[PDB]
């Protein structure tokens, strides 16, 4: 039969991160549960997230999720029954090129806030007398682009600290390489340690294909018969919002066509201003689904 269908080798939603900008924040900064702003559809970050800089290009980041389990058997069983798992530590190591405030703070485990540059620029980076176990907020967001709607993926973690610093070579063939591995810890005020998040306008196109939620099969414009005043009044302009069967907005991607531009014209932004009093029909399609809406315009 059609074994390719049951294979389900889509080979289209396999996103590959490109810009692994590792955001660092102090412990005082409140961690954010999402990397997307629920007001427009773009990316927003709370204040305090400062990028580490540029990471290794030829090698890149090597994230490792070590698993440690245990077997229990005391009554003569050929196989381990109830195989429990104890440790699920996640470690990742990335190289560094630039020497800025956050990088030195992370590599020396200090708070270089009271330090001040001298009158001639002379500075000293002091190792602590007692090594403080300062915790940091780490954000590991990747990038993938599909036309004008990219794919945003990130490795959310609200607690991380130094685990081991590898030996660095500062010879005359490469720049100084700071590649310390960090083991992710578990936070208490939020209840999660490592989180995988997908965002971006492009992810909306393939969220149904990925199997999350339900498939997009129905759509309807929420304003049934909106009324807009011809004059520049309070209700002169109106905003449309089409809702699908998956409970996700489809405004920024689905375009709206006004069959009667004389009465009211709707652009891609979904604005409903109205040119002349009357009734108009608006059709919204993206690539396969057609939805019809009726807009009434009066003075």
């Amino acid at each position: 039969t059609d074994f390719y269908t049951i294979k389900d080798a889509q080979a289209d939603l396999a996103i590959a991160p490109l810009n692994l900008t590792v955001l660092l924040a102090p412990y005082s900064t409140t961690p954010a549960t999402t990397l997307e702003s629920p007001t427009d559809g773009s990316l927003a970050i709370p204040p305090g997230y400062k990028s580490v800089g540029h990471f290794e290009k030829q090698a890149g980041l090597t994230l490792g999720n070590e698993f440690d389990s245990k077997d229990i058997e005391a009554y003569g069983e050929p196989e381990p029954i109830r195989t429990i798992i104890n440790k699920r530590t996640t470690t990742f190591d990335f190289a560094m090129y630039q020497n800025q405030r956050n990088v030195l703070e992370l590599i020396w485990t200090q708070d270089f806030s009271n330090i001040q540059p001298s009158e001639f620029g002379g500075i000293v980076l002091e190792a602590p007398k007692v090594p403080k176990n300062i915790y940091y907020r780490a954000i590991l967001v990747g990038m993938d682009d599909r036309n004008d709607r990219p794919i945003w993926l990130y490795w959310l973690m609200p607690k991380v600290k130094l685990d081991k610093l590898d030996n660095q070579t500062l010879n005359d063939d490469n720049v100084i390489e700071y590649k310390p591995t960090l083991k992710a810890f578990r936070d208490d005020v939020v209840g999660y340690s490592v989180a995988q998040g997908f965002a971006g306008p492009g992810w909306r196109d393939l969220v149904a294909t990925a199997g999350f939620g339900e498939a997009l099969t129905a759509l309807t414009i929420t304003p049934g018969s909106p009324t807009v005043t011809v004059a520049t009044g309070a209700s002169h302009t109106a905003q449309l919002l089409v809702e699908g069967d998956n409970g996700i907005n489809y405004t920024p991607d689905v375009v709206f066509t006004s069959s009667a531009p004389d009465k009211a014209s709707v652009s891609a932004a979904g604005l409903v201003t109205g040119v002349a009093a009357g009734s108009a029909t608006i059709t919204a399609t993206k690539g396969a689904l057609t939805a019809t809406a009726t807009v009434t315009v009066t003075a």
């Binding site: 059609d2 080798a9 080979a11 289209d12 396999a14 590959a16 490109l18 682009d145 004008d148």
Partner: protein
């Protein structure tokens, strides 16, 4: 143009991307992948031109949605200093390319992953062209794929319709 409708395109044609972006950046200086007769008409004074010719090297994986090719950069002009500064500008615009987008007139916007370097500048000796100065360099450019969906289905039904 009689290609089947169910197939739209496979790759990006990264050299078209590069020539279009260079023409858009500086419209005064023309750039392309051929040798127009108008440019060959005058040789003592030549409009600086950037040429991109595809060269072998680099694997490809459909599963990973990654493509790479050893596209080379060749610049020809009437002065050695002009060629050197043009090559420096090209390297400044190409080497620091890590996840960069640019849109074509076709409609899709390409994504350049990383543009490496294989061989350094090559000040070729003046052969057929004497006055013009030519410098050749090779870049390891990796680009993403537009659509990576497989076309097993349509081929299978075409085979079933033809024979069964």
């Amino acid at each position: 143009v009689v290609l089947p409708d169910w197939y739209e395109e496979a790759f990006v044609n990264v050299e078209n991307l590069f020539i279009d972006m260079f023409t858009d950046l500086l419209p005064d200086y023309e750039s392309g992948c051929w040798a127009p007769d108008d440019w060959l008409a005058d040789e003592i004074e030549v409009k600086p031109t950037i040429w991109f010719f595809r060269l072998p090297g680099g694997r490809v994986d459909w599963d990973g949605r990654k493509d790479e090719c050893q596209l080379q950069v060749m610049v020809v002009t009437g002065s050695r200093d002009d060629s050197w500064r043009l090559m420096d500008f090209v390297r400044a615009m190409l080497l620091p390319m890590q996840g960069d987008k640019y849109k074509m007139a076709d409609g899709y916007t390409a994504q350049i992953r990383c543009a490496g370097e294989v061989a350094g500048p090559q000040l070729l000796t003046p052969g057929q062209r004497i006055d013009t100065r030519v410098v050749t360099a090779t870049f390891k450019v990796s680009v993403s794929m537009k659509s990576a969906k497989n076309y097993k289905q349509k081929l299978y039904e075409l085979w079933q319709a033809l024979r069964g």
